[PDB]
Amino acid sequence: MVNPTVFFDIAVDGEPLGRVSFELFADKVPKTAENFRALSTGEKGFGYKGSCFHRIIPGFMCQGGDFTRHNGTGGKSIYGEKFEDENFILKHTGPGILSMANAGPNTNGSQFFICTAKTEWLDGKHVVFGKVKEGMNIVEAMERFGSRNGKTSKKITIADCGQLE
């Protein structure tokens, strides 16, 4: 009944930076929220721990979740390699939005991005399923290690992750 909360503990070239937590909108997008929640706990035997934010573009987004190819070409969901676009109820309203990366319709895997700007042109194309709850400052810090082309100047990792409450 209560939306779950997950955390990532972010490191920058292995140095602790801080914690970002997310509310997952399981009330709106249960299937997509469950995927992210289980990948954050690692309870299916794989997931986000130790993965990186391989693409960070300041004033746009931080993308991560590619734990199989580490570069934006990989990842898998808890349902199989890909799963459908659950719905597009929630929109890309501003910084902090948590949304699924994809390579076309119905190609959700594990990769996700945290918005650092409003990205309304993604509405109805990427599934929005959560939002930063605490540590938007940490995301802003992360974002400073990006670049226009998305390459990061330091390795931004999810040193630890899991479920809170």
Residues lying near ligand Nc1ncccc1Cl in the complex (CB under 6 A): 73-75, 80, 82-84, 101-103, 106, 109, 111
Q: Is 106 tagged catalytic?
A: no
Q: Least distance (Å) from ligand Nc1ncccc1Cl to the CB of residue 110?
A: 7
Q: Is 54 tagged catalytic?
A: no
Side chain identity, residue 57: I
Q: Of 74 and 162, which CB lies nearer to ligand Nc1ncccc1Cl in the complex structure? A: 74
Q: Of 4 and 109, which CB lies nearer to ligand Nc1ncccc1Cl in the complex structure? A: 109
Is-contact 129 94, C-beta < 8 A?
no
SS3 38: helix
Q: Is 102 tagged catalytic?
A: yes
Is-contact 48 156, C-beta < 8 A?
no
SS3 140: helix
Q: Of 12 and 61, which CB lies nearer to ligand Nc1ncccc1Cl in the complex structure? A: 61
Is-contact 159 1, C-beta < 8 A?
no
Q: Least distance (Å) from ligand Nc1ncccc1Cl to the CB of residue 138?
A: 23
Q: Of 32 and 111, which CB lies nearer to ligand Nc1ncccc1Cl in the complex structure? A: 111
Backbone φ and ψ of 25, nearest 5°: -85, 65
Q: Is 108 tagged catalytic?
A: no
Alpha-carbon distance of 164 to 86, in angstroms, equals: 24
Q: Least distance (Å) from ligand Nc1ncccc1Cl to the CB of residue 146?
A: 18
Q: Is 67 tagged catalytic?
A: no
Alpha-carbon distance of 35 to 18, in angstroms, equals: 23
Q: Is 55 tagged catalytic?
A: yes
- Burial of 165 (C-beta count, 10 Å sphere; 0-12/13-18/19+): exposed
- Out of 3, 102, 108, 111, the active site residue is 102
- Out of 55, 67, 90, 92, the active site residue is 55
Q: Is 113 tagged catalytic?
A: yes
Catalytic sites, residue numbers: 55, 60, 63, 102, 113, 122, 126
